[PDB]
Design an enzyme around this catalytic site. Structure first.
Site: not given
Ligand SMILES: *[C@@H]1O[C@H](CO)[C@@H](O[C@@H]2O[C@H](CO)[C@@H](O)[C@H](O)[C@H]2NC(C)=O)[C@H](O)[C@H]1NC(C)=O
Ligand SMILES: *[C@@H]1O[C@H](CO)[C@@H](O[C@@H]2O[C@H](CO)[C@@H](O)[C@H](O)[C@H]2NC(C)=O)[C@H](O)[C@H]1NC(C)=O
Length: 486
Positions: A174, A288
């Protein structure tokens, strides 16, 4: 009550044989190594992971960007600003960096992870630190170059031990959301190109998958940046997805069918950002994923009711030809598959194990007549080689699965299989409570035994494709004899 057509003639997707995965969050590490509660060695865990095999075991997440292999007093990075306490001068220069200093991935813990994954028929997908970088100047030079010295310390260790045959790699996490060095889309592309060049020097470690950049919908520009910068060396794009904030949610949020479409919109956004790329058809993974971010929903997302969004995600991913679904988390947080202390499986564990037992990788399109979307149906080929299905169902069998968040009983009118033999695998909560932590398969409680998975008890009392309100289950059409499945 509900009209359902399955186009069992046209294969719309072929997912990985290793469709299921579990995430082991890098927030389980401390400066002294794993927290003392963490269990990666119990025989029990080997049996539970085998139940989701063949699959993926992801070691990663936000905290991967301050994890350090064999951390000691001489570490290269210990005096570097991003790995020290925040100062007035560094407090305002980062993108949401936590300034947590350095965590320790010990030699013996890395040994235990390789042992656990090899032992469980899982691939170890390891999330390398992207925030070890050279060239940065505080207040003067924004640009910075990935430094591979830390990764090569772990690669040399892997080669020394003969590790590598079950290891896949990713880099950072991220970067759009959390980054000490404010990584751009262009920098992440350059980082993956550089990692691929390093891995060329460790051929025993370069035979599996290199995936990235582990972003959700606000970071899809980084998927395009990775495609442009290193797309010819990336096996698959890892995407992250959560339907809502777990921390502000309750039991009703987990039953709310308006959330279902959020997942489709993520896939549409990635296809759009890649529309002018040679990599538009690169495999997509959910690297994820869970229902609620902020660690899920206390005493809800570890309960039966978690199952509805869990099952919809598994069917809609497969329908979009998303190859792998990695569930956050195996344990820890409120969305753990297991209890972090006892390793006792939560209802979502049992749901994934049953899906893994019955559901193969060839996918068909299901047209379902319900504009409300409270009833969701998926169809894939029965898996014929699970410890359950081996010598029980044969190629051509179809697995239909479904969930019903309505408060009515629904009958799925699947005319095209009327008079075929149905084996039912219906999951319900012990005591009828949606917040039950215990799950019944056709009225029998699923549980272990001296760390053994229970035999799945098929219910041969067929007749129709029906779900009670707030239930889900799987229907194996044993004699569907579908050509595409042969
Ligand atoms: C790196 O990005 C951040 C965010 O875009 C820039 O601004 C800081 O953002 C953080 C939170 O992410 C705030 O807490 C800070 O106060 C913001 N700083 C400001 C406004 O200067 C930051 O300047 C960027 N750094 C560099 C080197 O460009
Ligand atoms: C939402 O977030 C807070 C944490 O920020 C959770 O409250 C904590 O719950 C833990 C136990 O899980 C306690 O140790 C902490 O003391 C709590 N902290 C605070 C500040 O209350 C809360 O459980 C979350 N709620 C939901 C619904 O998930």
């Amino acid at each position: 009550e509900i009209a359902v057509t399955i186009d069992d003639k046209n294969v719309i997707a072929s997912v990985s044989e290793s469709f299921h995965g579990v995430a082991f969050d890098a927030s389980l590490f401390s400066p002294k190594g794993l927290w003392s509660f963490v269990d990666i060695t119990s025989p029990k865990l080997f049996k539970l992971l085998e139940g989701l095999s063949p699959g993926y075991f992801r070691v990663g997440g936000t905290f991967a960007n301050w994890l350090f292999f064999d951390l000691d007093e001489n570490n290269k990075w210990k005096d570097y600003w991003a790995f020290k306490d925040k100062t007035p001068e560094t407090a305002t220069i980062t993108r949401r960096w936590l300034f947590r200093k350095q965590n320790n991935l010990k030699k013996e813990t890395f040994d235990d992870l390789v042992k656990l994954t090899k032992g469980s028929k899982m691939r170890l997908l390891f999330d390398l630190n992207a925030e070890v970088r050279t060239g940065y100047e505080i207040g003067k030079k924004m640009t910075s170059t990935w430094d591979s010295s830390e990764a090569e310390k772990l690669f040399k260790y892997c080669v020394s031990k003969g590790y590598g045959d079950n290891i896949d790699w990713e880099l950072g996490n991220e970067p759009d959301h959390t980054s000490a060095h404010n990584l751009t889309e262009k920098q992440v592309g350059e980082d993956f190109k550089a990692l691929h060049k390093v891995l060329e020097k460790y051929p025993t470690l370069n035979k599996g998958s290199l995936v990235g950049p582990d972003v959700g919908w606000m970071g899809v520009s980084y998927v395009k940046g990775l495609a442009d910068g290193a797309g010819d060396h990336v096996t698959a794009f890892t995407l992250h997805q959560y339907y809502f904030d777990g921390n502000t949610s309750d039991v009703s949020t987990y039953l709310d069918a308006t959330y279902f479409k959020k997942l489709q919109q993520l896939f549409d956004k990635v296809k759009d950002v890649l529309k002018n790329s040679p990599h538009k058809d690169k495999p997509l993974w959910l690297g994820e994923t869970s229902s609620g971010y902020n660690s899920g929903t206390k005493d809800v997302s570890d309960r039966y009711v978690s199952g509805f969004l869990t099952l919809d995600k598994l069917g809609l991913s497969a329908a979009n030809n998303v190859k792998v679904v990695i569930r956050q988390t195996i344990y820890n947080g409120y969305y753990g598959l297991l209890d972090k202390n006892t390793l006792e499986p939560n209802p979502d564990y049992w749901l994934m194990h049953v899906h893994n037992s019955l559901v193969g990788n060839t996918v068909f399109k299901v047209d379902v007549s319900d504009p409300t979307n409270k009833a969701r149906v998926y169809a894939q080929c029965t898996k014929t080689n699970s410890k359950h299905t081996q010598s029980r169902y044969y190629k051509g069998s179809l697995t239909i699965f479904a969930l019903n968040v309505g408060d009515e009983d629904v009958t799925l009118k699947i005319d095209q299989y009327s008079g075929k033999k149905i084996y039912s695998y219906i999951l319900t909560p012990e005591g009828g409570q949606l917040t039950s932590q215990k799950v019944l398969l056709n009225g029998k409680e699923l549980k272990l035994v001296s760390d053994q998975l229970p035999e799945l008890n098929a219910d041969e009392s067929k007749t129709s494709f029906t779900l009670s309100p707030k239930t889900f289950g799987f229907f194996v059409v044993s004699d569907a004899n579908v050509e595409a499945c042969k």
